[PDB]
Amino acid sequence: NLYFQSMSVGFIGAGQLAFALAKGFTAAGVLAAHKIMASSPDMDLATVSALRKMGVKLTPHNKETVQHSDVLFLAVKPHIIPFILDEIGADIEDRHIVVSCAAGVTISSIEKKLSAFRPAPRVIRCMTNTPVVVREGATVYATGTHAQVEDGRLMEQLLSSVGFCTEVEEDLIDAVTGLSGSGPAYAFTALDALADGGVKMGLPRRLAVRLGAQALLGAAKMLLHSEQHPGQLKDNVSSPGGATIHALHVLESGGFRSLLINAVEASCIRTRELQSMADQ
Amino acid sequence: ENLYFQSMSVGFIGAGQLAFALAKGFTAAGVLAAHKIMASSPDMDLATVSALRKMGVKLTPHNKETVQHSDVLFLAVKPHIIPFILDEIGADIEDRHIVVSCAAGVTISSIEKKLSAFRPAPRVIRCMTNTPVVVREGATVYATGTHAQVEDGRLMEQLLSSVGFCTEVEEDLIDAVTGLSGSGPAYAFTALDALADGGVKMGLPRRLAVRLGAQALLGAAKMLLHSEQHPGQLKDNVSSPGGATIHALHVLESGGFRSLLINAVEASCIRTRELQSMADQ
Amino acid sequence: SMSVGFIGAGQLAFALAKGFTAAGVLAAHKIMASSPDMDLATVSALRKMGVKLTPHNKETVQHSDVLFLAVKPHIIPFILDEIGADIEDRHIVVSCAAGVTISSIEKKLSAFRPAPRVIRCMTNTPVVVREGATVYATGTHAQVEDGRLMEQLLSSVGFCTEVEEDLIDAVTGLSGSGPAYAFTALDALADGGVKMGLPRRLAVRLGAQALLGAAKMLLHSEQHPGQLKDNVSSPGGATIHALHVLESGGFRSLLINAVEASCIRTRELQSMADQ
Amino acid sequence: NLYFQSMSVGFIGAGQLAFALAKGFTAAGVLAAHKIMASSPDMDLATVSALRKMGVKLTPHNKETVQHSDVLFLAVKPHIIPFILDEIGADIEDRHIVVSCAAGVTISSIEKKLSAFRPAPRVIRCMTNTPVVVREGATVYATGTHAQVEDGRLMEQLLSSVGFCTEVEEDLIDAVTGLSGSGPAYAFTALDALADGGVKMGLPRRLAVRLGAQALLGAAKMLLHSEQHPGQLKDNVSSPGGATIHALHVLESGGFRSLLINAVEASCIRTRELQSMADQ
Ligand SMILES: O=C1CCc2cc(C(=O)O)c(F)cc2N1
Ligand SMILES: O=C1CCc2cc(C(=O)O)c(F)cc2N1
């Protein structure tokens, strides 16, 4: 029965991640929609039309978001961040907790820009994913130089309401991006392909999408609720000589495992290239 | 609640992974008391047989006892035992029984051929389910046989819906479902092991990497199930231009990721047909 | 107290006799072995070990209680004809020849005496250091003590368990051919150690020790091999980098391919036996 | 023998390797569990749970481990080493033998850090693996600038109680890491896949794991006990036209040998990359 009575949340950016989090927070009951405000330079986005139905306050002016908010999410593209922080930097107060979800934007770069206006800005770096929209996100966060102990606990409380959330060291966020940030896209790709396979073997497309999604959801839930190794759970499904062990062999023959390792690695490395442009 | 007060007796011929998964699921659902379940196995030293004991499921080495106890009888053995099994307990199948075959590839026609030699109208249902019934998130399909009453199919759907998704299909779809959701959880466990390796390669502790990858898959599956959206649209929606995610998608494409999962569904389906081509011939 | 014979005096005959005598279960002089080409190195090796040697297969039969068939499979028919009239009630015939079915042996021997006691066994060369992997299947007329006796004899030179005969082709692909896969892998690992600067001899020793220690860890753990893999792979470390390059090559699938190919070939040989 | 009467051993780090060595040492009889002390900054590790049950005295203060030890194993990740050498570098005494088991951490770098406190730190670099836990490890060590003759002898004796052990030049340690350090992980991968193959061909999983593990163990022991080349052993067991030579062909067709060469090389090269971060 969680609810933040004295918290006002702002989003700079009204893209997919801002909508997902606002929808998750409101569905979770931790935050009334009208105590949330978001700002975007494009008031004709599909997400902007959706936020208005929820009752989120919308404004085109970032300073308006900053002046309304206590917790301020930065959910914009990384190249705009230096211009955003210049724009609202003079408007950051002691009460503000700045939570950056911008891709590869480091705590150092945000604190350096904001400290030019006011010392000790309270900064938290967040890496979350879109399944927060169904309250099954995976979120990690790292606390900045000046964030109080209570700032991180508060952020963990809020982000726990929309999925898994834990604190990490900041130099793990690139790797988490490659795993759970990009993970949902890997799964959507897998689900489309599995459904194609279902259709090839004779299933209606709709049924094949449903079954494949249910299979993935159930397997993930099994693992989360098991203490056992994913290899052990795989062993339990694969009856000797059966259909499943035959299909696993053709996965192995294509290097299935290595493609997913490749993917995690490529997403993490790209995130570091973006962290470099942030720090350069 | 309705099924519970039916006070249904359930039997499993076969006490393996799937029998344990379903027994665990049904009891967790509250639809069945563990001691109203009976399971038989030719081998009592299995680990699944021991977990079944601890649950309080009744265990016996005698298939006839499982049959006589049961109202709904699950057949959960390898496809090549089924003719031996139906020969053994075919005389004991009563008009009141619903026979539910889970044995992969085994056709309704083959079961009814054996059982029709004893009672004339055996009630047979063919089922294809998976191991996540154990956490009540299974994916189940079933096809009703020649003599299954309309109420038999509804009862089956109600029972299997308590542990996951369940819907009726025509029987000629079941081998393809086997390739998709029957074998699906194993594809996912393989993917999760690999994603965790990738997380560990890039600096995460194994424990956290397992947790994050599993949470990622779960939330993405839930997202798809709750949206009317095409999975490619969801993929589009989350891949920002120039971003880390689209870079990772490219390397998946470059290895033919999609084709491997199609290959897998196809190989599992074809294998199931090969096992049915020894059930029939 | 028991007398053991070997029709055949090759790699598998020597490995078993060396294993048994090293184990203290059999005295070298209570073992006899027969061979045509009495000029194999393994023949001269059994000689130095104390095993009695004869060129006449019938003499081995007359000497033995338990009679191992360690010949190539194309020789089994020509052998069951030669000695089939010399099999007695007391004999346990243990076939180790590749893909030779219990059916084919009992059918040939039943033409001489009903109820021949036949056991089919699939073992491997590491019995020579008492770390073999053995499975056996009992025939139609094998008494209970026959299989119990077999398990006691073979357990002295490694792991041993009973299986249904229709699992033996798969076991061949796994533990029957497995030592060859490990020898190939050890040669390759040593090549990699030498490329990175190690002397060959140290590289062979280190690679073999690593494989021995890993195998023992798994046997002595209750844990899944993937779990042990997780335990050794430090985040960001050298091991997880090396596992990625194995995965990129389809390493796992090649070993699956191997077990499958060896099993399938064994089945092809069982076919020519069953005709 | 007398090397071990009244010897105390300490571990800084309670990860996988400190448990493996502690379990192996106590099972060997060379040390008593109570005479072993370990320091971990997080009692949440699963290994820290087991170490306590062994009777190994645990503590969070690394300085306590240093005070209580004669032979000091450093079993942490390589990037904490500069932090840990700064923490207890003043507590290193002439009596200490400092044994580094941190990946890629060079003797030069440890001696550089500790030479700023007392002038002649006794340092040994060690490369062991996890099968020390069943006393079948493969260990090599390199002796540093100030290690006495008895120091190498004592290390050899200690590590010989849990497996193979020999002295190498330090510049072979990266190559050994790639071979016997990563080796057990190659074997676990191979065993999982060999079991998958046995399962595909009809075997129960449990029997397939047992049989594959027994085959590998027996083959390795066979090679250790023969004077013969691994290729000659391969020849001896491959009968003409038989099942084994058919299986070897499909291994060759996938470049099986080259993958394992690739693996040793990749692990060695990564160790060199870590060695460079130790000297930067
Ligand atoms: O309900 C069922 C039937 C038995 C079954 C067998 C396999 C197999 O691997 O052969 C499977 F993948 C899924 C199932 N699920
Ligand atoms: O002694 C030691 C500690 C350093 C080390 C690191 C790895 C790794 O690659 O993660 C390894 F496999 C073995 C060792 N051996």
From Swiss-Prot, chain C:
L-proline binds at residues 165, 238-239. NADP(+) binds at residues 7-12, 35, 57, 70-73, 96-98. GO terms for molecular function: identical protein binding; pyrroline-5-carboxylate reductase activity. One of its GO terms (cellular component) is mitochondrion. It catalyses: L-proline + NADP(+) = (S)-1-pyrroline-5-carboxylate + NADPH + 2 H(+); L-proline + NAD(+) = (S)-1-pyrroline-5-carboxylate + NADH + 2 H(+). It is an enzyme of class 1 (oxidoreductase). It comes from the Eukaryota. The modification N-acetylserine is found at residue 3. The keyword rRNA processing does not apply. The keyword Mitochondrion applies. Pathway: Amino-acid biosynthesis; L-proline biosynthesis; L-proline from L-glutamate 5-semialdehyde: step 1/1. Belongs to the pyrroline-5-carboxylate reductase family. This is Pyrroline-5-carboxylate reductase 1, mitochondrial. It comes from Homo sapiens. The gene is PYCR1.
